[PDB]
Each structure stands twice: as C-alpha cells, then as structure tokens.
C-alpha cells in the first residue's frame, strides 16, 4: 500500500533526518518514508559505512562465448538464496597484466551494480570451492565487511529481501528500466537492522531449512524424470 | 445553404442564351446536345463541372470568342503497359494557326491543394503524345480557378510558357511560372492585377480559409524539402527570413502604393528568377532596421537573406508566388483566419527544424502542465479583479517561445472565454478588459506589455519573434541579449520596460535584484557556457558564480526577477536535487523560496534528444519578514552550535583522549568536569548529536559513545565551505533546528508517462498521467448540430419526392407504350428506383444516429450547459460518446480543471498546495 502511492506529502522538518546533504526529491523521500515504516518497531538501525572494510569493483575485458580462455561469469549466475551458482559459459582468450584480485575466492560477498530495476543490488556469497580461478565481470563488487558485527550471508539475504529491493529500486540511477547502476556511495550510507549475530545465524538457518525443503521437491522432480527415462528405455528395448 | 452557389447559379441563369441548366434543389445538370457526350451525366460530380460551365460561358459570352474553336470532353484511348488509359482534357481553344491558345484544366476550388499530384498525370502525357505525333510546340498552358472575396468572384490563374521551358529541369528551375493573374483582351500579352491597398480587388486576402494552409504546408514539405530531405536547419532559416521580409512588407509599404514582395512586373511577362535577390536583400535590411533595430554593420554588410550555395532561387520564387495574397499581419483580423497562420508557423517549426543536444524544444504537454499547475489562470483573474493588471511573465531562456506562446493562449482563453464569469462586472474592470481583450480582432494585444523573454541565439531569437508576431503579439519584449546579462544592458526602444529596472538588496548581499515579475517559467540550459567578454557578472553580480556549476546561476537569476510573493515553475535537472556538490544551491532555495511541489518526470519526456532525469520545481518567493526571521533563527542556532562545538571538543580531549584538565576552559566546562555533573555531560552529547543516537546510547557510558562515534562527531563539528552567505556554522544541524520551527508541507509526485513517446521515428500516444483533457465542450449548441444537418436530409427528401413524381409520370407514359421495346428502359427505371431506395436507406440510417445523438444531448445537457454531476468529466460514458462516431467535431481539447476530484497529478497540484 505504501510503495504504490505515487504521491508523498513531505514536511520541511522531515528533510533533515539522517540526511547530512539536504537532499529533497520524490525518490529519496519515498525511500525514507518506506524505511521509516519498516524500521518502526525494529531498533538497532545502523549504517553500513561504519562496518564496511573495503569495496573493490571488478572489471571484465572483451570476451566471446567460449574462446578457451580464463572463464568469466554472467549476470544470471546471481541467485536470491545468496549462493553464487558457479557455472561459467564464456571465457576470455587474451591475457591481462594484473589478475591477482580479479579471481573469485571462497566466502566473498558479491554485489550487482548494473541490472534491471528489480534485480539490482542483488547480493551473493561464494560458498563452494573455487578451485580454478574465474574472472568476475565489471557488474560486480567484492565487499569486505566487519565479520565480528555482521555475518557475510546475512547481508546477502537482506539485500535479496524486500528490505534491500525497496531501497535499491529508488536509489538506483539508470538511463532505462533495463539497466540501472548503483555505486558505493549508497552502500556507505545504507541503513540496516543489525540484530545480535545469534539472530542473524537463526535467520540463515530458517532460510537454509526452508530451501532444503524445496530441494526435496526438485529431487522428487528428477525422480519423475528418471521414471520417464526408464519407461522409454523399457518400451524401446522390448 | 451556401450563398456563393446561389450567386453562381443566378449569374449563369441571367445569360441570354439558354445553353446549360443546373438545379441544386433537384441536384441535376443538363447541357446542350451540340457537344457529344459518351455517358449520361445525371448526378453532380462536384464543383468542377460548375466551374467548367462558368468558364465556358465566360469565354463564349464575355470574351467574344467563337464557340467553334472550343473543345471540351475530348476522349483519348491509349494502351499503357498491360492496361488501357483514357485521359481527358478539359478546355482546348486553338487559334487560326492550329496552336492551342488555351489549354485549360478545370478542378474544384476545394480540391486544389490535394489534387496537385494528379497534374503530372494529366499534362505531360498529352504533350509527349503531341510531340510524338506532330512534333509541334504548344505556346501557353493556362490553369484557372475562381475565388470569393466580399461576395465577388475574382480570377487567379497560372500561365506557363512551354517553349520558354521545353524541359522538365527548366520548368523546375522556373518555380511554377505564372505570367499573369488575369487574362487580357484583344490578343494582348497577359497582365497581372496589382496587389495594392485601396482597391478591394487589388487588396490582399483577409478571409483566410482553413484548408488551403494545410495544402501549402504539405506542398512545402514535398517540394521545398525535396521529399528526401528532412530536418535541415538552413532551409527553415531561409523560410523564416522570407516570412520576416513579408512581415516587414505589410509593416512599411502601407497604403497608396503596391507591395514590393510581389513581382513588380513592369513588363507584361514575368521576368527571370534573377534580379530579385537585390530587392529581397534591401528589403531584408529594411527589416532589422525597422523591427529589430540591430546595430551590427558587418551583419548588415554580409546580407544573407538566403545562402546561395544551398538555397537555389527557384524555390525562393516558388515561395514568393505561393505567399502573395496571404497577408500575415492582417490575416489574423478575421475570425476564420484568426489562428490559421499561427498553426501554420508552429507546423513549420515542428516539421523542418532539426533539434539535438544543446538545441531542442520543450514538449507542449509539459509546458501546459507547468502553466496550469502554477494556477496562472486564477492568478491572472485575481490580479485583474484586485489591481486591474495581468501577471508579468518572463522566460529568461525562451528558445522558440513555447512557454510564452502557451501562457498567452492560456490567459486569453481563460479570462476571455472559459472563466470569464469569475471576473467582476465593475465599470473600471470592464474598461480595463476593454483595452485588454475586447476588440476581438487582436485578442493577444495585452502581451506587448506583459510578456518578456530572453534568448542567446540570434537565429532562434528571430524565429521566436516571427512566431509570436504570427500568434498576435508585437513581440517587442523578446530579447536576444543573453539571459544572465545585467539589467542595464537590456535596452529597447519601446518606453515601458520592466527589465531595465534594478536596485540593490540588503538581504541578497547588496547585489542588485529586479523584483518586478510575477511568474518566471523556464527550461534552463544544462550548461550555460557564459561568454568571456563580460565575466564581471560571474563574480560581482552573482553570489555563487565562482563555483564549478555555472548553470545554478539561473536559479539566482530567478530570485532577482521575481517579486515578493512571485511564482516559479522550472524544469530543473535531477542532479540539482540529489548531489552533494549542489547542496549550496539547495540551501539557497530554502532560504528565499517556499518550495511547494517537486514533480518528477520520466526519462522518456525529452526523447530522443536527451536521456537524463529532470524534475519540476514549483516555488514562491519569500517576503522580507519571513527571510529576516530565517536569518535571525539561523544566527541563534548557529551561535548555539558554535558554543556546543567548542564545549564538546574540550570534553573529548579530557574525558576520552586523557589530556589533563586546564583552567583555560569555559567555567561551566570546568565545574562540570570537577564536581562530575555527568547528567549535563550526557545532555550536551544528546543535543550536539541530535540524530545519530538511539535509546541504547543514553544508558551506555559516555567514553565508549565518543569512541564509537568519532567520525560522526568530527563530521558534525566541521563547518561549511561556502562561508559568508551562511556564516561559519554547520548547515545540517542549524538547518534542522530552524526547519523544525518553520515547517511547511511539500508536495511530491512522479509521472510514469507523459501522454506521448517520441522515438526517433515518430510520436505514439501513451497514457498522460499529468492532466486529462475535457473531451466534452462546456458549450454545445443544439441548433448548430440540428438545423444545418437536417437541411441536407430534407433537401434530399424534396429532391427524391420530385424524382418520384417524374418517375411516376414516366411510368405512365411507358404504360401507354409497347412493352417489347419498353423493357430496356423499364429495367433502367427499376435501377433508378433501387438507387433511390438505397440512397434514402442511408439517409434513414443517418437519421437514426441523429436521433440518438439528440437523445444524448437531451440526457447530458440542460440549456447548452454541462450539469454539475457531468461538469467534472469522470464519466467515461459521455467521453466515449464524444470521441466516437460523428461527434469527433466540436470536441474540447482543453485541459480539465476538476477542482474537486483527484485522479491525475495536476488535480492534486491545483487542490493540495496553497499559493499565499
Ligand atoms: C531549453 S531550449 C527551449 C526553451 C523553451 N522551452 C522553448 O521551447 O523555446 C532553449 C535553448 O536556448 C539556449 N539558451 C537560452 N537561454 C540561454 C542563455 N541565457 N545562455 C545560454 N544559452 C541559452 C539553451 O541552450 C537551450 O538549448
């Protein structure tokens, strides 16, 4: 109801509330109103700039599907569960001068810079073994955070939740609805509910169990697929 | 019924020799048996046959020519490709030597502007056949038509010498050669009647018909533009210069002498396209020595009414010939020609001008939303009622004058026609309205006093001036002297000048502010690129001229032009609203303006020329009392913050950093440190921080709080960068404190669509989301849709009754005849009967929709007035009635001001915000 309003009545006093730059605009004030509604009962709201250690933007050179070079990812590899589904399809055949930090490592936080207004700012965590070094494209940000206060996967789950979707649909600056590009400035200024680490682990556990249930559903699905295969084979053989 | 048809019928009937008969009541025409006809003409094919008969009568009776040399309805049979073609020639008159003296093609007067494409299909083939057969040359080709001026029939004709231009290339370079407007008797060379004031026949046209202007526009698009050449700036500029020259002609040539725009034609035959360049150039100097009063000798010396390299003179002579009788300054006098020329020129700008980065036009739907969202109509009505004046609108960046033109057409329409009931009927108000709007021939007469503008581009300045002359204004106030030049430089001959006046303002900083205008609407350029010749205005005249963003100077200009309480509606880029570098300007507006609406716009608004997000800002200038209150509150809270900063930084050094206490500190500081009044310690932290602290912070120890904050407390401690204007205090802290006291509500909204989508190819309609058209007029006349509509149907009923009587007489006269030979014409009479029954069938069918629309009129209208429940067009049913079927006419495309129902952003603008 609040998000689909298209009209905001803003008071003058409301402008200078955690603003520090006196920004008045429809999008910024709509985002602030939605955040005020969200964080009403929730407490312990804190900025991400205090608990951020560093942010490094990746970069990707010219490449073709295949090419027998070092592999690169795609925009479809990002997932809502917060796990980077590593399955590169394209690679770069020519070499660069420096590639030390352009590879993907385990336990990293990747942020989507440029994508559709819906799937922008999408975050993922690399949990599987990287083994071979793989290049992550320019539309990514490696985010190193303070591990003592905030857990790596909790931020990804928050960003993929509506908490981050609503913020990034108004903060994103793009020339079209197909691609909108976020930057690091709003990552510095973003406000989060940061409960004790125990609560973050509890949330992660609930998400993991409710995703394992769905995993049981698709494993039943390939059980049905194998049944189809067996029926075809037994019909053909005799 | 039309008077001219009856006049023509009477003129043809008054002739002594009864050779042709017409009957409009019966809709029949009959001709003498002397000329053989291959078909039985029984129905009126159009005005073409009447014009041909009139020309035949004029030739036979008035010009005393022998009828034996006249040939009409000549049949040709040719085999073209796989088909057969039968072209026809209208009038052939040959002399004693056999050469065609008159080769006349007859066309309907209302079909001339659209039939030109068929001319090539009717004339060149016959000439080619004649060359193939006899290898002879035709001497003169004559194209004739009639025109109605003051109930008098005048003749406008084109005479082309075939031998003079034997080839198509020579004919194209000739530019529609017309030897003379009228013919001459006694084998004389053709002569054109002078176009001179004094004689009504010689005088120009003032009753401009609505349709031929569209034909002229499409002909210019198809001929001047080459068909394959679109969006060329230089051709448009040449056309603009030609129109300006024509305007100067009516301005200066005055009465008693012929105009110099027309071909002077000292000789009987029209001369070559040359020897007119000197004429038009001297005329183009007389213009800009009379209207613009320019003082550039190099610009006068370079001439350049046209450029010879890309504007050949054949198109020039075509344009000159096309615009001989279309008096622009006097065509607006007539009600029919009131808005014809303005629409013509706005179509010229719309189709022909190429616009891109830096130079592009604001779309009309945004302009009208800006003008109506300021309640400019209500402001003008209130100004007229209270102070007997109209608002003083200025647009300091008017490129094509779109904002000014829309403001003019809005004020005139609202005050004079739409909302005329709001204005009072007092004698003083009535006389002021008399000298403003009443004469009704030039209703845009007030503009000369109340409409200003500034443009930096000379070419677009001339374009704006000519556009706004053709729309009705004198266009004296539009300046081509840059938007940001000082108020002293803006000088022009006419005495009442509200832009010259200036005076320093103590609050502004001693800088000079005008303070004379009521409304300031503009579309500020993204980058001003201010000229290096006069850079003293950057520093001395403007507060923030030294900054990198030089476009933000425009906002400061808007403070100087507006009056205390004036209105400002502008399309600012979104970067002004959300960028730290622009913060200084955002603190500026809140200091002096009362922000009232920030309407965001989609990025499809300015496509395809630019793709950047822009927003609408509506603000009102603040009076001296409010800004001095702001200044005093700013000073108070800045001093309080100044004390808090020093105190809290002294607190940090001891209580966290550990530096021993010193007696050089403030007495309250030292005693609070000594006797440990930690409650005040916490209170000062809370007050200095304001936000950035939560409920957990109050219980937690102060030392850990300070360690945790550090960065935030340092950021708050740092003062501002602009200095002088703000006064060494923190803008965020003091701004929050002052805005708590002076709170007012701001309205914000976003539009997703703007009623159009301009791809590179063309426009495609979309939902508006900004405003809704009325779609239903507030004044509908029953007698306008009833009597004239029924005249045709009852005339046809009388005609078919007479036809039925004569058919019955023929039926009897064939009943007493023998059947075997009768059968063929009896079947023909049956065909006539079935034609009559089917025609009366569609008349009955259209009478049904007549009845249903009459029922709708009775249901929705009461004494030609929309009822209060139907006043606000929320009823989609009535709207769908008007925009369907035959109710396409009499529509109202005006913007609807509902004032009680909120559906689209403009309604929330006009209801939610208050301008006072
Ligand atoms: C915004 S466009 C169209 C303005 C108006 N909406 C119209 O339709 O005519 C006006 C153009 O004139 C130019 N212009 C106007 N005033 C100017 C000034 N004072 N200094 C520099 N350029 C100016 C801008 O570059 C802009 O491209």
- Inter-chain contact B583–A27, Cβ cutoff 8 Å? no
Closest CA to A138 of A183, A174, A94: A183
Distance, in Å, from the CA atom of B287 to the CA atom of B343, rounded to the nearest integer, reads: 23
Q: Judge: A6–B749 Cβ closer than 8 Å, yes or no.
A: yes
Q: State the burial class of residue B38 (Cβ atoms within 10 Å of its Cβ: 0-12, 13-18, 19+).
A: exposed
Contact B480, B507 (CB under 8 A): no
* Residue pair A91/A62 in contact by the 8 Å Cβ criterion: no
CA distance B778 to B757: 30
Tell me the chain B residues in contact with residue A11 when contact means C-beta distances shorter than 8 Å: 743-746
Q: Count of alpha carbons within 13 Å of B693, Cβ hemisphere only? A: 21
Count the alpha carbons within 13 Å of B448 in the hemisphere toward its beta carbon: 16
Sort B353 into a burial class: Cβ within 10 Å, 0-12 / 13-18 / 19+: buried
E strands, B34-151, are 70-75, 78-80, 83-85, 88-94, 100-105, 140-149
Ligand 1 centroid–CA B479 distance in Å is: 12
What is the full DSSP assignment across B479-546? E-S-SSS-TTT---SSS--SSS--EE-TTTTS-EE---EEEEEE---S-----SS--HIIIII-TTTT
Cβ contact B478:B401 at 8 Å: yes
Q: Which of B347, B430, B348 is nearest to B388 (CA)?
A: B430
Q: What sign does the dihedral B244-B250-B254-B256 (CA atoms) show? A: positive
CA dist B388 and B374 (Å) reads: 20
Q: Give CA B223 to chain center in angstroms.
A: 23
Query: How many other β-carbons are positioned within 10 Å of the β-carbon of residue A42?
Result: 10
Task: With beta carbons less than 8 A apart as the criterion, state whether A78 and A153 touch.
Answer: no
* C-alpha gyration radius of chain B: 38
Between CA B604 and CA B611 the distance in angstroms is: 7
* CB B350 within 8 Å of CB B221: no
CB count, 10 Å around CB of B629?
15
Q: Which two tokens stand for residue B258?
A: 């012929």
Nearest to B800 by CA among B769, B838, B827: B838
> What is the spatial distance between Cα B232 and Cα B234, in angstroms, rounded to a whole number?
6
Q: Are B776 and B879 in contact (CB under 8 A)?
A: yes
How far is it, in rounded angstroms, from Cα B670 to Cα B654? 11
* C-alpha–C-alpha distance, residues A205 and A157, integer Å: 12
Q: What is the resolution of this structure in A?
A: 3.3
**What is the C-alpha separation between B886 and B890, in angstroms, rounded?**
10
Task: Please answer whether residues B91 and B106 qualify as being in contact, where contact means their C-beta atoms are separated by less than 8 angstroms.
Answer: yes
- Other Cβ atoms less than 10 A from the Cβ of B530: the count is 20
B458 Cβ inside 6 Å of ligand 1: no
Q: For residues B438 and B87, what is the distance between their CA atoms, to the nearest angstrom?
A: 55
Phi, psi of B503 (to 5 degrees): -160, 145
Q: 3-state DSSP call for residue B183?
A: coil
Q: Which two tokens stand for residue A119?
A: 């799937």
SS3 call for B261: coil
Ligand 1 contact via B144 beta carbon (within 6 Å): no
Specify whether the CB–CB gap between B614 and B565 falls below 8 A. Answer: no
The span from the first CA to the last CA of chain B, in angstroms, equals 55
8-state DSSP, B205: B
- A29 CB neighbours in chain B (<8 A) are 748
Residue B29: C-alpha distances to residues B23, B47, B70, B104, B639 (Å): 6, 12, 20, 22, 99
What interhelical angle do B212-223 and B340-350 show, nearest 10? 20
In this complex, the residue of B696, B745, B750 whose CB is nearest that of residue A10 is B745
**Alpha carbon B100 to chain centroid, angstroms:** 48
Cis peptide leading into residue B608 (ω within 30°): yes
Cα separation, B479 vs B483, in Å, equals 9
DSSP character at residue B615? E
Residue B201 has phi, psi (to 5 degrees) of -65, -40
Q: Is B467 in the pocket of ligand 1 (CB under 6 A)?
A: no
Q: Residue B301 is encoded by which pair of tokens?
A: 């010396």
Contacts of the segment B851-855: beta carbons below 8 A, 24+ positions apart? B853/B785, B853/B885, B853/B886, B853/B887, B854/B782, B854/B786
Dihedral in degrees, nearest 10, Cα atoms B186, B190, B195, B199: 10
| Alpha-carbon torsion (B124, B126, B131, B136), positive or negative | negative
C-alpha B845/C-alpha B878 separation (Å) is: 22
Contacting residues for B689 by C-beta, under 8 A, at least 6 apart: B709, B712, B713, B716
Q: CB neighbours of A152 closer than 8 A, spacing ≥ 6? A: A107, A108, A109, A125, A145
Give per-residue burial for A59-86: e unless 16+ CB within 10 Å, then b.
ebbebeeeeebbbbbeeebbeebbbbeb
Q: Which of B590, B729, B742, B748 is the best substitution to test chain A (most A C-beta atoms within 10 A)? A: B748
Q: Residue A161 CB: number of other CB atoms within 10 A?
A: 15
| CA dist., res. B524 & res. B550, Å (int) | 11
CA pair distance B106, B112, nearest whole angstrom? 10
CA of B525 to the centre of ligand 1 (A): 6
Distance CA A222, CA A237 (A): 22
A112 within 8 A of A122, measured Cβ to Cβ: yes
Decide if A18 and B748 are in contact by the 8 Å CB cutoff.
no
Q: H helices then E strands: how many in chain B?
A: 32, 23
How many CB atoms neighbour CB B450 within 10 A?
Answer: 24
B359 three-class SS: strand
Packing angle, helices B47-57 and B3-13, rounded to 10:
40
Cα dihedral A126, A127, A129, A133, rounded to 10, equals 0
- Map tokens 């609050």 to a residue: B507
Q: How far apart are CA B145 and CA B142, in angstroms?
A: 10
* Whether the Cβ atoms of residue B321 and residue B178 lie closer than 8 Å to each other: yes
Phi and psi, residue B509, nearest 5°: 130, 15
Beta bridge partners of B293: none
Chain mean position to CA B695: 61
Pairing status of strand B503-504 against strand B517-522: unpaired
Look up residue B814 and give its two tokens. Answer: 């064939």
Three-state SS string over A81-124 comes to CCECCCCCCEEECCCCCCCCCCECCCCCEEECCEECCCCCCCEE
DSSP A182-193: --HHHHHH-EEE
Q: Which two tokens stand for residue A1?
A: 């109801």
Q: Please enumerate in sequence order all residues whose Cβ is within 8 A of that of B445, keeping only pairs 6 or more positions apart, or say none.
A: B436, B437, B439, B472
CB A177 within 8 A of CB A116: yes
Pairing outcome for strands A114-115 and A90-92: unpaired
Going B374 to B375 to B381 to B385, the CA torsion angle's sign is: negative
Report the 10 Å Cβ neighbour count for B609: 14
Q: At what angle do helices B678-689 and B667-674 cross, to 10 degrees?
A: 130
Hey, what are B466's tokens? 């000519």
B846-867 b/e (C-beta count within 10 Å ≥ 16 → b): eeeebeebeeebeebbeeeebe
Tell me whether residue A10 is exposed, middle or buried, using C-beta atoms within 10 angstroms of its C-beta: 0 to 12, 13 to 18, 19 or more: buried
Structure tokens, B261: 């725009």
Question: Ligand 1 centroid to B398 CA: how many Å?
Answer: 6
From the centroid of its chain, how far is CA B96? 56
Return the bridge partners of B159, or none: B142
First-residue to last-residue Cα distance in chain A = 62
Q: Quick check: B749 and A26 CB within 8 A?
A: yes
Ligand 1 lined by B525 (C-beta under 6 Å): yes
Residue with tokens 């007035």: B865
Please give the full DSSP string across B839-863, using - where no structure is assigned. Answer: HHHHHHHHHHHHHHHHHHHHHHEET
Under 8 Å CB-to-CB from B189, ≥6 apart: which residues? B268, B269
Cα(B426)–Cα(B388) distance, integer angstroms: 11
Q: How many residues does the structure list for chain A?
A: 238
- Specify the ligand 1 atom closest to the Cα of B482: 19
Give the strand pairing for B763-765 and B745-750. unpaired
Name the strand (E) or helix (H) holding B907. Answer: helix B905-912
Test A25 with B736 for CB contact under 8 angstroms: no
Q: Do B739 and A10 touch (CB under 8 A)?
A: no
The pair of structure tokens assigned to B555 is 């906002």
Q: Which residues of B touch A19 (CB under 8 A)?
A: 732
Q: What is the CA B775 to chain-centroid distance, rounded? A: 20
Please list the residues that pair with B156 across neighbouring strands: B145
The answer to whether the CB of B477 is under 6 A from ligand 1 is no
CA-CA distance, B490 to B498, in Å (whole number)?
10
- What does the block give as tokens for A158? 């928050």
CA B501 – ligand 1 centroid, Å: 23
Of the CA atoms within 13 Å of residue B763, those in its CB half-sphere come to 11
How many of the other CB atoms lie within 10 Å of CB of A22?
Answer: 21
Q: Within a 13 Å sphere around the CA of B349, how many CA atoms are in the beta-carbon half?
A: 24
3-class secondary structure, B900: coil
Distance, in Å, from the CA atom of B630 to the CA atom of B735, rounded to the nearest integer, reads 10
Backbone dihedral region for residue B817 (phi beyond 0: left; psi -120 to 50: alpha; all else: beta): beta
Q: Ligand 1 center to residue B523 CA distance, Å?
A: 7
| C-alpha–C-alpha distance, residues B896 and B471, integer Å | 24
Q: Which of A121, A125, A157 is nearest to A139 (CA)?
A: A121
In B238-303 the beta strands, taken as DSSP E runs, fall at none
CB B50 within 8 A of CB B104: no
- Length of chain B in terms of residues written: 916
Q: Return d(Cα B502, Cα B479) in angstroms, integer.
A: 17
Whether residue B332 contacts residue B412, with contact meaning beta carbons closer than 8 Å, is answered with: no
What is the rounded distance in angstroms from the CA atom of residue B133 to the CA atom of residue A76?
77
**Separation between Cα atoms, residue B306 and residue B235, nearest integer Å:** 9
Considering only CB atoms, which chain B residues are within 8 Å of A45?
694
Cα–Cα nearest to B739, from A21, A13, A17, A20: A13
Looking at chain B, which residue has its C-alpha nearest residue A15?
B736
Partner-chain contact B739 A24, CB within 8 Å? no
B649/B805 Cα distance (integer angstroms): 113
Q: Tell me if B400 CB under 6 Å of ligand 1.
A: yes
HSE, side-chain direction, 13 A CA sphere, residue B526 = 12
- Cβ of B530 closer than 6 Å to ligand 1, yes or no, is no
Contact residues, chain A, for B574 at CB < 8 Å:
25
Residue B684's Cβ-side half-sphere holds a number of Cα atoms within 13 Å equal to 24
Burial of B460 (0-12, 13-18, 19+ CB in 10 A): buried
Alpha carbon distance B399, B395 (integer Å): 9
Cα gap B73→B88, rounded to integer Å: 6
Bridge partners (DSSP) listed for residue A191 = A47
Let me know: does B648 contact B713? Beta carbons within 8 Å.
yes
Ligand 1 close to Cβ of residue B404 (< 6 A): no
Strand partners, B794: none
> Please, which residues have CB within 8 angstroms of residue B319's CB and are 6 or more apart in sequence?
B220, B224, B239, B242
């Amino acid at each position: 109801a609040l998000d689909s309003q298209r009209r905001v009545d803003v008071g003058l006093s409301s402008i200078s509330s955690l603003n520090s730059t006196i920004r008045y605009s429809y999008r910024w004030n709509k985002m602030k109103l939605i955040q005020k509604y969200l964080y009403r009962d929730i407490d312990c709201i804190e900025p991400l700039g205090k608990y951020i250690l560093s942010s490094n933007n990746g970069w990707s050179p010219e490449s073709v599907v295949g090419g027998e070079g070092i592999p690169i990812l795609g925009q479809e590899h990002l997932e809502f569960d917060g796990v980077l589904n590593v399955s590169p399809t394209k690679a770069t055949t020519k070499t660069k001068n420096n590639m030390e930090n352009f590879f993907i490592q385990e336990g990293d936080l990747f942020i989507s810079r440029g994508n559709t207004v819906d799937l922008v700012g999408l975050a993922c965590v690399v949990e599987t073994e990287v083994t071979e070094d793989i290049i992550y494209p320019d539309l990514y940000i490696r985010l190193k955070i303070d591990e003592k206060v905030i857990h790596k996967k909790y931020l990804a789950l928050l960003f993929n939740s509506f908490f981050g979707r609503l913020y990034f649909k108004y903060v994103s600056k793009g020339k079209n609805q197909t691609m909108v590009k976020i930057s690091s400035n709003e990552l510095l200024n973003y406000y989060l509910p940061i409960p004790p680490m125990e609560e973050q682990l509890e949330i992660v556990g609930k998400i993991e169990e409710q995703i394992g249930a769905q995993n049981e559903i698709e494993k039943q699905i390939e059980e049905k697929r194998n049944q189809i295969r067996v029926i075809i084979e037994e019909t053909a053989r005799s | 019924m039309k008077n001219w048809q009856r006049i023509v019928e009477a003129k043809l009937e008054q002739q002594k020799h009864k050779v042709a008969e017409i009957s409009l009541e019966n809709g029949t025409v009959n001709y003498s048996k002397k000329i053989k006809h291959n078909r039985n003409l029984k129905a009126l094919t159009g005005d073409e046959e009447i014009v041909r008969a009139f020309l035949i009568d004029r030739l036979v009776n008035e010009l005393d020519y022998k009828p034996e040399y006249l040939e009409t309805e000549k049949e040709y049979t040719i085999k073209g490709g796989h088909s057969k073609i039968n072209p026809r020639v209208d009038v052939l008159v040959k002399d004693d030597k056999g050469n065609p003296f008159f080769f006349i093609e007859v066309k309907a007067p209302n079909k001339f502007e659209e039939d030109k494409d068929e001319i090539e299909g009717q004339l060149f083939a016959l000439a080619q056949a004649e060359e193939r057969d006899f290898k002879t040359k035709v001497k003169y080709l004559v194209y004739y038509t009639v025109e109605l001026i003051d109930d008098e029939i005048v003749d406008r004709a084109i005479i082309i010498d075939f031998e003079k231009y034997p080839t198509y290339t020579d004919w194209s370079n000739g530019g529609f050669i017309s030897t003379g407007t009228e013919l001459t008797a006694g084998y004389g060379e053709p002569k054109k009647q002078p176009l001179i004031k004094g004689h009504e026949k010689y005088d120009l046209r003032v009753r401009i018909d609505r349709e031929e202007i569209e034909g002229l526009g499409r002909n210019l698009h198809n001929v001047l533009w080459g068909g394959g050449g679109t969006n060329d700036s230089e051709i448009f500029y040449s056309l603009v210069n030609i129109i300006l020259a024509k305007i100067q002609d009516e301005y200066e040539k005055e009465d008693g002498q012929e105009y110099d725009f027309q071909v002077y034609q000292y000789g009987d035959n029209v001369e070559s396209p040359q020897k007119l360049f000197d004429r038009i150039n001297a005329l183009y100097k007389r213009a800009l020595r009379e209207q613009l009063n320019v003082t550039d000798e190099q610009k006068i010396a370079e001439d350049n009414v046209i450029n010879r390299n890309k504007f050949p003179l054949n198109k020039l002579v075509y344009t000159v010939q096309a615009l001989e009788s279309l008096s622009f300054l006097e065509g607006r006098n007539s009600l029919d020609g009131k808005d014809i020329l303005g629409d013509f020129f706005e179509s010229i700008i719309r189709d022909g001008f190429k616009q891109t980065k830096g130079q592009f036009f604001t779309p009309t739907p945004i302009v009208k939303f800006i003008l109506y969202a300021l309640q400019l109509d209500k402001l003008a009505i209130d100004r007229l009622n209270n102070d007997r004046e109209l608002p003083l609108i200025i647009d300091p960046s008017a490129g094509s004058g779109t904002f000014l033109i829309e403001a003019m057409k809005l004020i005139t329409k609202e005050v004079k026609y739409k909302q005329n009931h709001k204005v009072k009927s007092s004698r003083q108000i009535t006389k002021r309205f008399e000298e403003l709007f009443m004469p009704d021939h030039n209703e845009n007469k007030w503009a000369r006093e109340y409409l200003y503008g500034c443009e930096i581009n000379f070419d677009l300045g001339t374009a704006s001036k000519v556009n706004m002359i053709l729309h009705g204004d004198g266009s004296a106030n539009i300046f081509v002297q840059d938007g940001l030049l000082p108020f002293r430089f803006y000088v022009k001959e006419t005495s009442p000048n509200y832009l010259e006046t200036a005076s320093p303002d103590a609050l502004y900083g001693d800088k000079e502010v005008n303070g004379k205008f009521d409304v300031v609407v503009s579309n500020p350029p993204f980058s001003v690129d201010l000229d290096t010749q006069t850079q003293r205005e950057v520093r001395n005249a403007f507060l923030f001229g030294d900054k990198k963003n030089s476009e933000n100077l425009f906002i400061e200009r808007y403070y100087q032009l507006l009056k205390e309480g004036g209105r400002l509606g502008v399309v600012l880029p979104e970067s002004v609203f959300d960028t730290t570098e622009n913060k200084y300007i955002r603190l500026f507006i809140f200091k002096y303006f009362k922000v009232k609406a920030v309407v965001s716009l989609p990025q499809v608004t300015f496509e395809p020329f630019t793709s950047t997000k822009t927003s609408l800002l509506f603000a009102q200038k603040k009076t001296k009392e409010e800004v001095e209150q702001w200044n005093e509150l700013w000073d108070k809270y800045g001093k309080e913050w100044s004390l808090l900063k020093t105190r809290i930084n002294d607190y940090f050094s001891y209580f966290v950093k550990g530096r021993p206490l010193n007696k050089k500190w403030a007495p309250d500081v030292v005693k609070d440190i000594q006797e440990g009044n930690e409650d005040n310690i916490r209170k000062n932290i809370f007050r200095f921080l304001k936000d950035h602290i939560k409920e957990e912070d109050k219980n937690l120890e102060i030392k850990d709080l300070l360690i945790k904050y550090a960065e935030e407390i340092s950021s708050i401690s740092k003062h501002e960068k602009e200095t002088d204007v703000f006064g060494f205090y923190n803008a965020w802290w003091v701004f929050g404190e002052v805005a708590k006291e002076l709170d007012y509500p701001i309205f914000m909204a976003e539009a997703e669509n703007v009623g159009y989508k301009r791809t590179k190819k063309g426009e495609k309609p979309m939902p508006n989301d900004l405003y809704d058209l009325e779609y239903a007029p507030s004044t509908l006349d029953c007698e306008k849709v009833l009597s004239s509509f029924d005249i045709e149907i009852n005339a046809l009923e009388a005609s078919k009754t007479k036809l039925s009587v004569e058919k019955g007489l023929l039926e009897e006269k064939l009943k007493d005849k023998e059947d075997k030979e009768n059968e063929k014409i009896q079947k023909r009479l049956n065909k006539i009967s079935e034609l009559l029954e089917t025609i009366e069938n569609q008349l009955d069918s259209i009478r049904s929709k007549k009845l249903e629309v009459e029922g709708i009129l009775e249901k929705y209208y009461e004494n030609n007035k929309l009822k209060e429940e139907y006043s606000e067009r929320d009823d989609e049913e009535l709207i769908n009635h008007f925009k369907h079927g035959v109710l396409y006419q009499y529509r109202s495309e005006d913007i609807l001001l509902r004032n009680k129902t909120v559906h689209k952003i403009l309604d929330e603008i006009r209801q939610g915000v208050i301008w006072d």
